[PDB]
Amino acid sequence: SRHSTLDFMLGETILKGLQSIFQEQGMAESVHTWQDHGYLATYTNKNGSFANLRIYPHGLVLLDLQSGKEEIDSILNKVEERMKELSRVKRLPPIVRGGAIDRYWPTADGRLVEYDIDEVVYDEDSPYQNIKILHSKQFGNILILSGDVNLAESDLAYTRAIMGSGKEDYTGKDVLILGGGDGGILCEIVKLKPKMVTMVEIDQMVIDGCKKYMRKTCGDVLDNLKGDCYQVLIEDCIPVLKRYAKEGREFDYVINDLTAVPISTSSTWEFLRLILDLSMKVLKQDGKYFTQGNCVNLTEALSLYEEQLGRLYCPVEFSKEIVCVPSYLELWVFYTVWKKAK
Amino acid sequence: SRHSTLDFMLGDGETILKGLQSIFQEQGMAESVHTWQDHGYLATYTNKNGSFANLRIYPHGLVLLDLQSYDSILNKVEERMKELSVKRLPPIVRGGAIDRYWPTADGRLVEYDIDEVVYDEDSPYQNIKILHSKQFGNILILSGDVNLAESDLAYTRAIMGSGKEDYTGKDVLILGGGDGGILCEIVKLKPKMVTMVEIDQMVIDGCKKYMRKTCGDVLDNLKGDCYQVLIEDCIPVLKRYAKEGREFDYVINDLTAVPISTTWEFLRLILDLSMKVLKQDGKYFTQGNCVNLTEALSLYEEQLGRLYCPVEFSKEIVCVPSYLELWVFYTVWKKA
Ligand SMILES: CSC[C@H]1O[C@@H](n2cnc3c(N)ncnc32)[C@H](O)[C@@H]1O
Ligand SMILES: CSC[C@H]1O[C@@H](n2cnc3c(N)ncnc32)[C@H](O)[C@@H]1O
Q: CB–CB of A97 and B321 under 8 A?
A: no
Q: Are A139 and B106 in contact (CB under 8 A)?
A: no
Within B168-309, residue ranges assigned H as helices are 181-186, 201-210, 212-215, 234-243, 264-276, 294-304
Q: Give the domain A154-342 fold.
A: Rossmann fold (3.40.50)
Which amino acid does the sequence have at B322?
Answer: S
B27 CB near a chain A CB, below 8 Å?
Answer: no
The partner residues of B30 in beta bridges, in order of sequence, read B46
In a 3-state reduction of DSSP, which class is residue A45?
A: coil
- State yes or no: A182 annotated in a binding site: yes
Which stretches does DSSP call E strand in A74-224? 89-90, 95-96, 117-125, 130-136, 140-145, 148-152, 174-179, 196-201
Within chain A, residue ranges assigned H as helices are 13-23, 69-86, 156-162, 184-190, 204-213, 215-218, 237-246, 268-281, 299-309
Q: Is A1-97 a CATH 3.90.1150.10 domain?
A: no
Q: Which residues of A touch B65 (CB under 8 A)?
A: none
Q: Is the dihedral of CA A245, A179, A164, A312 positive or negative?
A: negative
Element (H, E) at B154: helix B153-159
Q: Spell out the domain ranges in chain B.
A: 1-94, 95-150, 151-336
The residue among A38, A45, A32 whose CA lies nearest residue A10 is: A38
Which amino acid does the sequence have at B290?
Answer: C
Q: Give the domain B151-336 fold.
A: Rossmann fold (3.40.50)
Is B66 part of the annotated catalytic residue set? no
Q: Are B143 and B126 in contact (CB under 8 A)?
A: yes
User: Resolution (in Å) of the shown entry?
Assistant: 2.5
Q: Are A170 and A194 in contact (CB under 8 A)?
A: yes
How would you list the strands of the sheet with A140-145, edge to edge? A117-125, A130-136, A140-145, A148-152
CA–CA separation, A275 and A280 (whole Å): 8
Burial of A74 per CB tally in 10 Å (0-12, 13-18, 19+): exposed
Burial of A247 per CB tally in 10 Å (0-12, 13-18, 19+): exposed
Q: At what angle do helices B72-83 and B13-25 cross, to 10 degrees?
A: 140
Which amino acid does the sequence have at A168?
Answer: E
CA–CA separation, B298 and B189 (whole Å): 34
- State yes or no: A324 annotated in a binding site: no
Q: At what angle do helices B264-276 and B294-304 cross, to 10 degrees?
A: 40
Buried (b) or exposed (e) across B267-292, using 16+ Cβ within 10 A?
A: bbbbbbbbbbbbeeebbbbbbbbbbb
Q: Are B291 and A136 in contact (CB under 8 A)?
A: no
Technique used: X-ray
Q: Are A97 and B7 in contact (CB under 8 A)?
A: yes
Distance of CA A255 to the CA centre of its chain: 20
Q: Are B130 and B141 in contact (CB under 8 A)?
A: yes
Q: Are B16 and B63 in contact (CB under 8 A)?
A: yes
CA–CA separation, B314 and A221 (whole Å): 32
- Distances, alpha carbon B140 to alpha carbons B124, B183, B218, in Å: 17, 16, 17
- Distances, alpha carbon A275 to alpha carbons A236, A256, A268, A298, B214, in Å: 11, 9, 11, 21, 40
Q: Which of residues 274-293 of A touch B (CB under 8 A)?
A: none
Q: How close does chain B come to A233, measured CA to CA in Å?
A: 34
Which amino acid does the sequence have at B310?
Answer: P
In degrees rounded to 5, what are phi and psi of residue B332?
-125, 140
Q: Which of residues 35-94 of A touch B (CB under 8 A)?
A: 35, 37, 40, 42, 44, 47-48, 50, 52, 54, 56, 60, 62, 64, 66, 88, 90, 92-93
State which CATH number among 3.40.50.720, 3.30.160.110, 3.40.640.10, 3.40.1480.10 fits the domain covering B1-94: 3.30.160.110
Domain B95-150 superfamily per CATH = Spermidine synthase, tetramerisation domain (2.30.140.10)
- Angle (CA) A21-A24-A27 rounded to 5° is 90
In degrees rounded to 5, what are phi and psi of residue B325?
-165, 145
Q: Which CATH architecture has domain A98-153?
A: Roll (2.30)
A313 CB near a chain B CB, below 8 Å?
Answer: no
